Amino acid sequence: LKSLERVALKGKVTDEKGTFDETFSGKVFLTVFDGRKKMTALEEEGNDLSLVYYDYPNVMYAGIAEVKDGLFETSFIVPKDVNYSEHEGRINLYAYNESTKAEAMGVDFSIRVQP
Amino acid sequence: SSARLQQRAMGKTADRSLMASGHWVKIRVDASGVYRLTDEQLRANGFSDPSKVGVFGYGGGVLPEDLSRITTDDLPPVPVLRQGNALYFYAVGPVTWFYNPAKTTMEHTVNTYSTHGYYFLSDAAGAPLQMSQYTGGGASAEALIDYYDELMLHEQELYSPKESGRDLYGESFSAVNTRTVKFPLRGNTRSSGELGTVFSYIAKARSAGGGREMSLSANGILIFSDPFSMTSNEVSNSYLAGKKRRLYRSTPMNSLVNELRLDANYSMTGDAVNLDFIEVATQNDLRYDGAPMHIRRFSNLPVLGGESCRFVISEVPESLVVLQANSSLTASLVPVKTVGDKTIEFVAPPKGQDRRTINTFYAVDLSQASAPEILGAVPNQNLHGEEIPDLIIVSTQALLPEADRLATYRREKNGLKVLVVLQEQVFNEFSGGTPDATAYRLFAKMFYDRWKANAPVGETFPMQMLLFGDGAHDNRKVSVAWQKPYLQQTEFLLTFQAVNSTNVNSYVTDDYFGLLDDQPASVNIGWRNYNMAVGRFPVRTPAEARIAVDKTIRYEEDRESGAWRIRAMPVRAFQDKKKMLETLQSGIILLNYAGHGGPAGWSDEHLLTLNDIHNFNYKHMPIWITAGEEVFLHEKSGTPIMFSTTRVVYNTQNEKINGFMLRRMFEKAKDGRYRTMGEIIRSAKQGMLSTVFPDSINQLSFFLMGDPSVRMNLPTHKVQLTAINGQDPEGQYGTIMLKSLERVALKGKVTDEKGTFDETFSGKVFLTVFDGRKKMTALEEEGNDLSLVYYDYPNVMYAGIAEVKDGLFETSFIVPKDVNYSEHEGRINLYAYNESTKAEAMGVDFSIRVQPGIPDEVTEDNTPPEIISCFLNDSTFRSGDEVNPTPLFMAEVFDLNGINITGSGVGHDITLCIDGRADLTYNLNAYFTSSATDAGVGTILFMIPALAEGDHTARLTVWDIFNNAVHHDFSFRVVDGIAPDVADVILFPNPVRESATFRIFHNRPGSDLNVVVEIYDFTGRLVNSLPVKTYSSSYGEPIEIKWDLTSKYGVKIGNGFYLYRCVVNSPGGQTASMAKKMIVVAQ
Amino acid sequence: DRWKANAPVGETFPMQMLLFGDGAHDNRKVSVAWQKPYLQQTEFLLTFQAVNSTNVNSYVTDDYFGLLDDQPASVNIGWRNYNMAVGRFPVRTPAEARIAVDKTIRYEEDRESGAWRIRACFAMPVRAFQDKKKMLETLQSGIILLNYAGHGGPAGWSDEHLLTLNDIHNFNYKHMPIWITATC
Amino acid sequence: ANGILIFSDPFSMTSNEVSNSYLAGKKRRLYRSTPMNSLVNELRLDANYSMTGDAVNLDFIEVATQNDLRYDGAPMHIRRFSNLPVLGGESCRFVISEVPESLVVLQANSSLTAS
Ligand SMILES: [Ca+2]
Ligand SMILES: [Ca+2]
């Protein structure tokens, strides 16, 4: 994914066994990070180095999308932001079937932001 | 050198306490005043000669946190005056008062640690410290005064918000909008005069703005009306937890005579508003009104600081004295003069020349003085005379044996000088028996000061302190929440609460107890040097304590848990040959952040102690070992330690700090061992002051919950196999193919933690070889539920020891004809011990995989069994030696395809035929025990029956499964009562899963002798000694002992290679058996 | 009994019981070890002790409370039908209790903790040796491991100090309890 | 009892029984009727264990005396089982003397069945 690129997402909802659930219809919530959280030590010429979490893998996008008969599709524009991050990004997904009150969830690490 | 003499001679602390001898009786008070002890009372409390008894201690009122201000040491003698049959002294209660020159009034202070002032009575003295005359009484008075300031204090310590401060709060205005407080006004109170009042309360609004007002009124006259308000954001905040307000004011009042009715009114219902206290100061005449009077004078002073006043008290009974008593240790008798009927006069300064002290003149009728609370006799003690220990364990009474158990463990295993004391004892010698957080600090300081004197430049203080016990925020347990019948008034260790400037915020900390330097008072508790590491076990009951100690002991002893970290979620740290070496020693400690689980009021009523807050249950990932500039770090072995804080900390632009990293955490000290967690944390803590980057809010206070003497269970040295049957095993998994009855040759080395070859490591290596890996196996059936085991018998192929010379070793073993259906990787456990450095090395290898023994069992085995050894009673036995009528025949035997235990089938049985006689033909098949550790090896152990004194001959014959036989002829001379008493033992089963049974065979049946089964570990340390006595009834039968695998410290032993043997404690000496290999696998 | 009347054939009793409180072995708290005001003034829930033939051995159990069938007396407490599931929070004080409830609430609500078990698609993972449709049954399988509360004291200590269920079975949900069997 | 020996029970254990941790004591219950004389104000029972240092504890002593059917200024739970001259369910004439006639006799095997 490149800065200011429109990225198109497509996905499905399955059961615990991974079989496609066409009965799952409602909304899907999904947040997209440009990287992974990682502990960072603020170094200096002192042996002790108090450390944080770069708990700001930047949020590239966050939005909702309708899920009809097991499927959904949305898109978002990649912001002009931090891509020095090595390795994968992260997409968190949470779907809710309004009629059955059932919850679905997923995590994806296929994306990588580029300069 | 000559300066050494000047250091000792100018020694602050005593080399021996006064409490070391003489009779000691603890007493206490709940109110400052004069207390009396009659000779009869003293005789009745063990004082044989009451003339020699004196008073000792400080009383209530806290010790200064500015150590330089503490001038006294050990047990300070209290000045006492004697009448006839009794002695009197001025005691000091928990409430004490000080002068505030800004508000030109006096203010009170409650002892946070104690509800009483403790003192001591003792003959040790030889005689009491006689009270002296007051000297400060000036010659000329610059003013004749007609009244003094009588102080009173309404204060209910009901609620204890943990966050607010060191203070407790009283009465709420949440439901009741108006609360009335009545003060008794006493005789000498003047009808009319200025009514001084300090009104302290706290308030949090539940809605924004609004007409909220706290109003006081005395006997209907309004003193004040204070407006209160809060912002929507202040109401919305969780941490804001109330605005403290203190209103000072003198109100001219009339007709105040029997009772003073104060009426506090808060105009709004539903808020979180509480009264803290009300101080009332009345103007009273200098006249005895049948009650002692603490004469103080500060209001409308007509004189300057240090100038003398003429005081004249009327209606004095003649059995009354006036003491100038600002403290117990400075009480003096004011020399008065009689100036009329029941009228006396003295001259003195009401206020000191410092202009910040208001002298107290206590007038008291000694006929009315009564005894303090005699608590009782206390045993002698001498903490002052203790040698500098390595560790100080401060315990409560209940927890003492559990503390002493840990002490004994550290003394024995870690080889430490450890001092165990009861906090009571610390209070006796460092705060005159009164509970005070500073008493701990002073006790530590004693040793610190002593050490520093001779300590070399650069060296850090080696001592550590372990607070063995939980601590309550409300130290006095006076709040309402502390009176629940369900939780009950147990003994806790004190908590110290670092209060900041003007009671704004406050944090509870144990670091206070390790601030032992002589730094100046300008340095706040936060920026002082952490000299001594402090750790705490927040345990309430002995059950909780035993669990803590057992966890800590089992950590150090489970050597196999430490090899798991060497056998290697994993988060990568981005830091912002020689360079990679520093990162191998690095480590990350992550703080545990104890939350706010309750909706404001719940926490305050239910989270009362450090244990409740920092839940000391084993919480997620505390220590990480570090194994484009992204370093990979892994969390390893459940270390008993926990680092906990409640307050959160942020970095430049609110970035939350999750912990800290020490680039030289795992760097070994001069002793070649890693540093103790306590020291690691102490240097860490000390470093967070020291650096100019964490100088603002970046400094953070956390709890070391755990034994500070704990060392991370991580190997100092590793054992590495270099060749197995000629193949290089490094990096291989189930590659090196081994066959049944194949001689396998092993070769290996010993390295340091970095993996560099250690040629200095020389001693013995213990190693056990398994054909596979432990795996869970479910016993299946057509039922959905399937109860499951562990195939906790990946069969032991071999187990033995080997010498380690200049870093290397080599041994061999024969693969037994056993289970090879196992698929993939086998396992070799290695444990080396360097006898000279007492250092331990460990290793695990998975390069081996057993293969099918092609299985025709052809008649190749024509080689008969080999008699390895064949003795009577001892190992030092040559054929034809002397022996008593009841021998104990022992014989080690070997055949690659096994010995005959089948039974019958002609003379195939193992037999001992003495003097070629059928009369004593024994089926010793039942006395043979196949070696679980050495392939083909077997051992025979039996007790030969008695016979007359003469030369004898015997033949041992043993047959193998392939029908090849062997004979072994030997002779021996029986002599009536010549041999010593000796026994041997066999372990059933081996390896050991849950329990072990030891069957002992002896040489002297019937006779009453002392046998013991001793178990040792690869380091040679005794695990335990199971003792047994041979009873008369059991004539000629072996004895059995069952063992639950618990160590001498009462902890179940871990998996590993052990050595069992038995010793016979005879009168003239001790005879031991040969050590035998014991392997433990299911623990 | 009320449910069974109208319950359809095959359906199991749906009700459950939660004993919200710790239990003492000496229910009357009359033994010497119990003589101590905290231990005394605390209210506990009862403990049931399944005593066998002629007081030989005995085990403490809460399963007794779920034995609601009308089976005959010949069937011992060990062989009767566990009709109702029973669970216990061995908590003594409200502080203990709040911690238990907070832990249980936060478990259901932390949806992200449940996605960590589903995230394991990258491959203390122990392999169980037992005896498309066959692989489907193993995805639904699970292993529960029992926590074995030991004998930490030298005989007499345990009897004077381990007085309640909480003291014996240490409450703070400890060591690997539930394993999910996963297949690629 | 009052100096008259009721019994003397021999006790013993194997080296393996002593060595075991779970063994935790052998429960023993001794039943017995002893003809006694002069039992009138107090009955002194003297239990003696011949060996010091063992883990031996008394559980209880039940004592059953033969008493006359006569009011002795204290309520009496009249039960009769010893040397019964009748079979189960057969009736007997009970005669109590010295009764104050503010006295009743309830046949009370339980609270709910008191008559
Ligand atoms: Ca207060
Ligand atoms: Ca042979």
PDB file of C-alpha atoms in Angstrom, chain C residues 8-152:
ATOM      1  CA  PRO C   8     -38.952 -32.831  26.929  1.00  0.00           C
ATOM      2  CA  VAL C   9     -37.393 -36.322  26.757  1.00  0.00           C
ATOM      3  CA  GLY C  10     -33.589 -36.120  26.240  1.00  0.00           C
ATOM      4  CA  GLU C  11     -33.195 -32.447  27.381  1.00  0.00           C
ATOM      5  CA  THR C  12     -30.723 -31.928  30.291  1.00  0.00           C
ATOM      6  CA  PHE C  13     -31.512 -29.728  33.335  1.00  0.00           C
ATOM      7  CA  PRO C  14     -30.371 -26.168  32.334  1.00  0.00           C
ATOM      8  CA  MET C  15     -29.973 -24.573  35.812  1.00  0.00           C
ATOM      9  CA  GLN C  16     -26.557 -24.061  37.488  1.00  0.00           C
ATOM     10  CA  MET C  17     -25.426 -23.148  40.983  1.00  0.00           C
ATOM     11  CA  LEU C  18     -22.653 -20.763  42.057  1.00  0.00           C
ATOM     12  CA  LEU C  19     -21.514 -21.045  45.681  1.00  0.00           C
ATOM     13  CA  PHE C  20     -20.369 -17.412  46.171  1.00  0.00           C
ATOM     14  CA  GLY C  21     -18.111 -18.005  49.143  1.00  0.00           C
ATOM     15  CA  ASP C  22     -15.278 -20.103  50.682  1.00  0.00           C
ATOM     16  CA  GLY C  23     -16.024 -23.194  52.799  1.00  0.00           C
ATOM     17  CA  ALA C  24     -14.449 -24.615  55.987  1.00  0.00           C
ATOM     18  CA  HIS C  25     -13.794 -28.345  56.519  1.00  0.00           C
ATOM     19  CA  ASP C  26     -14.723 -27.894  60.235  1.00  0.00           C
ATOM     20  CA  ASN C  27     -18.134 -26.330  59.315  1.00  0.00           C
ATOM     21  CA  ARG C  28     -18.901 -25.468  62.966  1.00  0.00           C
ATOM     22  CA  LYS C  29     -15.446 -23.798  63.351  1.00  0.00           C
ATOM     23  CA  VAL C  30     -15.246 -25.573  66.817  1.00  0.00           C
ATOM     24  CA  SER C  31     -11.679 -27.039  66.545  1.00  0.00           C
ATOM     25  CA  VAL C  32      -8.819 -25.318  68.322  1.00  0.00           C
ATOM     26  CA  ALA C  33      -7.243 -24.106  65.065  1.00  0.00           C
ATOM     27  CA  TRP C  34     -10.450 -22.189  64.310  1.00  0.00           C
ATOM     28  CA  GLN C  35     -10.363 -20.348  67.661  1.00  0.00           C
ATOM     29  CA  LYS C  36      -9.380 -16.882  66.382  1.00  0.00           C
ATOM     30  CA  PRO C  37     -11.923 -13.928  65.906  1.00  0.00           C
ATOM     31  CA  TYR C  38     -11.324 -13.426  61.964  1.00  0.00           C
ATOM     32  CA  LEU C  39     -11.739 -17.087  61.216  1.00  0.00           C
ATOM     33  CA  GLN C  40     -14.510 -17.146  63.896  1.00  0.00           C
ATOM     34  CA  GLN C  41     -16.588 -14.027  62.897  1.00  0.00           C
ATOM     35  CA  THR C  42     -16.363 -14.800  59.080  1.00  0.00           C
ATOM     36  CA  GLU C  43     -19.458 -16.495  57.497  1.00  0.00           C
ATOM     37  CA  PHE C  44     -18.637 -19.341  55.153  1.00  0.00           C
ATOM     38  CA  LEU C  45     -20.744 -21.483  52.882  1.00  0.00           C
ATOM     39  CA  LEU C  46     -21.042 -25.138  53.998  1.00  0.00           C
ATOM     40  CA  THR C  47     -18.782 -27.930  52.766  1.00  0.00           C
ATOM     41  CA  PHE C  48     -20.141 -31.453  52.189  1.00  0.00           C
ATOM     42  CA  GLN C  49     -17.893 -34.384  52.978  1.00  0.00           C
ATOM     43  CA  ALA C  50     -18.666 -37.592  51.161  1.00  0.00           C
ATOM     44  CA  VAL C  51     -17.997 -40.081  53.989  1.00  0.00           C
ATOM     45  CA  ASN C  52     -17.596 -43.758  52.790  1.00  0.00           C
ATOM     46  CA  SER C  53     -18.559 -47.089  54.522  1.00  0.00           C
ATOM     47  CA  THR C  54     -17.549 -47.092  58.276  1.00  0.00           C
ATOM     48  CA  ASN C  55     -15.592 -43.705  58.259  1.00  0.00           C
ATOM     49  CA  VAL C  56     -12.571 -45.361  56.476  1.00  0.00           C
ATOM     50  CA  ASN C  57     -11.754 -42.460  54.016  1.00  0.00           C
ATOM     51  CA  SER C  58     -13.602 -39.277  53.022  1.00  0.00           C
ATOM     52  CA  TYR C  59     -13.390 -36.579  50.371  1.00  0.00           C
ATOM     53  CA  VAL C  60     -14.831 -33.064  50.441  1.00  0.00           C
ATOM     54  CA  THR C  61     -17.036 -32.326  47.387  1.00  0.00           C
ATOM     55  CA  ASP C  62     -19.528 -29.762  46.076  1.00  0.00           C
ATOM     56  CA  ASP C  63     -20.924 -32.282  43.579  1.00  0.00           C
ATOM     57  CA  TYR C  64     -23.323 -33.384  46.412  1.00  0.00           C
ATOM     58  CA  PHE C  65     -25.345 -30.228  45.826  1.00  0.00           C
ATOM     59  CA  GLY C  66     -26.077 -31.277  42.220  1.00  0.00           C
ATOM     60  CA  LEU C  67     -27.480 -34.763  43.017  1.00  0.00           C
ATOM     61  CA  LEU C  68     -31.152 -34.029  42.432  1.00  0.00           C
ATOM     62  CA  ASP C  69     -32.475 -37.303  40.880  1.00  0.00           C
ATOM     63  CA  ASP C  70     -34.887 -39.686  42.569  1.00  0.00           C
ATOM     64  CA  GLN C  71     -32.448 -42.648  42.411  1.00  0.00           C
ATOM     65  CA  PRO C  72     -32.662 -45.375  45.112  1.00  0.00           C
ATOM     66  CA  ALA C  73     -30.571 -45.338  48.369  1.00  0.00           C
ATOM     67  CA  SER C  74     -28.330 -48.327  47.204  1.00  0.00           C
ATOM     68  CA  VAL C  75     -26.527 -45.835  44.836  1.00  0.00           C
ATOM     69  CA  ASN C  76     -23.669 -44.179  46.858  1.00  0.00           C
ATOM     70  CA  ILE C  77     -22.863 -40.428  46.479  1.00  0.00           C
ATOM     71  CA  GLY C  78     -20.026 -41.458  44.085  1.00  0.00           C
ATOM     72  CA  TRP C  79     -22.350 -43.369  41.642  1.00  0.00           C
ATOM     73  CA  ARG C  80     -25.390 -40.982  41.554  1.00  0.00           C
ATOM     74  CA  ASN C  81     -26.185 -38.691  38.580  1.00  0.00           C
ATOM     75  CA  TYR C  82     -24.673 -35.141  38.583  1.00  0.00           C
ATOM     76  CA  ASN C  83     -27.906 -33.383  37.496  1.00  0.00           C
ATOM     77  CA  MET C  84     -26.890 -29.780  38.095  1.00  0.00           C
ATOM     78  CA  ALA C  85     -23.506 -28.157  37.505  1.00  0.00           C
ATOM     79  CA  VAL C  86     -22.114 -26.560  40.661  1.00  0.00           C
ATOM     80  CA  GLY C  87     -19.270 -24.041  40.777  1.00  0.00           C
ATOM     81  CA  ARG C  88     -17.624 -22.147  43.632  1.00  0.00           C
ATOM     82  CA  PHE C  89     -15.785 -18.837  44.188  1.00  0.00           C
ATOM     83  CA  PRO C  90     -13.862 -19.675  47.388  1.00  0.00           C
ATOM     84  CA  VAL C  91     -13.668 -16.004  48.407  1.00  0.00           C
ATOM     85  CA  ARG C  92     -13.718 -14.937  52.102  1.00  0.00           C
ATOM     86  CA  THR C  93     -13.704 -11.117  51.948  1.00  0.00           C
ATOM     87  CA  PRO C  94     -15.433  -8.718  49.507  1.00  0.00           C
ATOM     88  CA  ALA C  95     -11.970  -7.673  48.220  1.00  0.00           C
ATOM     89  CA  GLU C  96     -11.361 -11.292  47.240  1.00  0.00           C
ATOM     90  CA  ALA C  97     -14.840 -11.412  45.688  1.00  0.00           C
ATOM     91  CA  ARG C  98     -14.477  -8.217  43.660  1.00  0.00           C
ATOM     92  CA  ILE C  99     -11.228  -9.538  42.212  1.00  0.00           C
ATOM     93  CA  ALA C 100     -12.996 -12.823  41.134  1.00  0.00           C
ATOM     94  CA  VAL C 101     -15.990 -11.009  39.567  1.00  0.00           C
ATOM     95  CA  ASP C 102     -13.802  -8.342  37.874  1.00  0.00           C
ATOM     96  CA  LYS C 103     -11.617 -11.237  36.413  1.00  0.00           C
ATOM     97  CA  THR C 104     -14.790 -13.092  35.178  1.00  0.00           C
ATOM     98  CA  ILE C 105     -16.360  -9.860  33.700  1.00  0.00           C
ATOM     99  CA  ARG C 106     -13.165  -8.653  32.033  1.00  0.00           C
ATOM    100  CA  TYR C 107     -12.760 -12.192  30.490  1.00  0.00           C
ATOM    101  CA  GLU C 108     -16.048 -12.021  28.557  1.00  0.00           C
ATOM    102  CA  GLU C 109     -15.586  -8.401  27.554  1.00  0.00           C
ATOM    103  CA  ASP C 110     -11.932  -8.567  26.320  1.00  0.00           C
ATOM    104  CA  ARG C 111     -12.870  -9.665  22.804  1.00  0.00           C
ATOM    105  CA  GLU C 112      -9.199  -9.149  21.703  1.00  0.00           C
ATOM    106  CA  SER C 113      -7.981 -11.865  24.187  1.00  0.00           C
ATOM    107  CA  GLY C 114     -10.186 -14.430  22.327  1.00  0.00           C
ATOM    108  CA  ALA C 115      -8.634 -13.496  18.914  1.00  0.00           C
ATOM    109  CA  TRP C 116      -5.116 -14.517  20.236  1.00  0.00           C
ATOM    110  CA  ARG C 117      -6.182 -18.233  20.259  1.00  0.00           C
ATOM    111  CA  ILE C 118      -7.546 -17.751  16.652  1.00  0.00           C
ATOM    112  CA  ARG C 119      -4.295 -15.879  15.659  1.00  0.00           C
ATOM    113  CA  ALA C 120      -2.233 -19.127  16.039  1.00  0.00           C
ATOM    114  CA  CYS C 121      -1.783 -19.745  12.253  1.00  0.00           C
ATOM    115  CA  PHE C 122       2.044 -19.150  12.106  1.00  0.00           C
ATOM    116  CA  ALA C 123       3.101 -22.830  12.559  1.00  0.00           C
ATOM    117  CA  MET C 124       4.282 -25.420  25.944  1.00  0.00           C
ATOM    118  CA  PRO C 125       2.713 -26.914  22.867  1.00  0.00           C
ATOM    119  CA  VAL C 126       2.542 -30.616  23.911  1.00  0.00           C
ATOM    120  CA  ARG C 127       1.439 -33.260  21.313  1.00  0.00           C
ATOM    121  CA  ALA C 128      -1.222 -35.801  22.503  1.00  0.00           C
ATOM    122  CA  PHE C 129      -0.764 -39.414  21.192  1.00  0.00           C
ATOM    123  CA  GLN C 130      -4.261 -41.034  21.047  1.00  0.00           C
ATOM    124  CA  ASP C 131      -5.814 -44.132  19.255  1.00  0.00           C
ATOM    125  CA  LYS C 132     -11.659 -34.432   6.430  1.00  0.00           C
ATOM    126  CA  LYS C 133     -14.457 -35.669   8.779  1.00  0.00           C
ATOM    127  CA  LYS C 134     -11.871 -37.288  11.147  1.00  0.00           C
ATOM    128  CA  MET C 135      -9.839 -34.018  11.348  1.00  0.00           C
ATOM    129  CA  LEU C 136     -13.106 -32.048  12.039  1.00  0.00           C
ATOM    130  CA  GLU C 137     -13.733 -33.886  15.375  1.00  0.00           C
ATOM    131  CA  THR C 138     -10.167 -33.081  16.619  1.00  0.00           C
ATOM    132  CA  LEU C 139     -10.767 -29.286  15.937  1.00  0.00           C
ATOM    133  CA  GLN C 140     -13.679 -29.420  18.427  1.00  0.00           C
ATOM    134  CA  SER C 141     -11.612 -31.461  21.021  1.00  0.00           C
ATOM    135  CA  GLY C 142     -10.164 -30.071  24.239  1.00  0.00           C
ATOM    136  CA  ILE C 143      -8.102 -31.181  27.239  1.00  0.00           C
ATOM    137  CA  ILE C 144      -8.727 -30.145  30.820  1.00  0.00           C
ATOM    138  CA  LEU C 145      -5.885 -30.672  33.252  1.00  0.00           C
ATOM    139  CA  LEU C 146      -6.543 -31.082  36.961  1.00  0.00           C
ATOM    140  CA  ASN C 147      -4.787 -28.933  39.519  1.00  0.00           C
ATOM    141  CA  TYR C 148      -3.514 -31.234  42.297  1.00  0.00           C
ATOM    142  CA  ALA C 149      -3.568 -29.397  45.666  1.00  0.00           C
ATOM    143  CA  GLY C 150      -0.611 -30.852  47.626  1.00  0.00           C
ATOM    144  CA  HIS C 151       0.459 -31.649  51.200  1.00  0.00           C
ATOM    145  CA  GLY C 152       2.807 -28.734  51.901  1.00  0.00           C
TER     146      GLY C 152
END
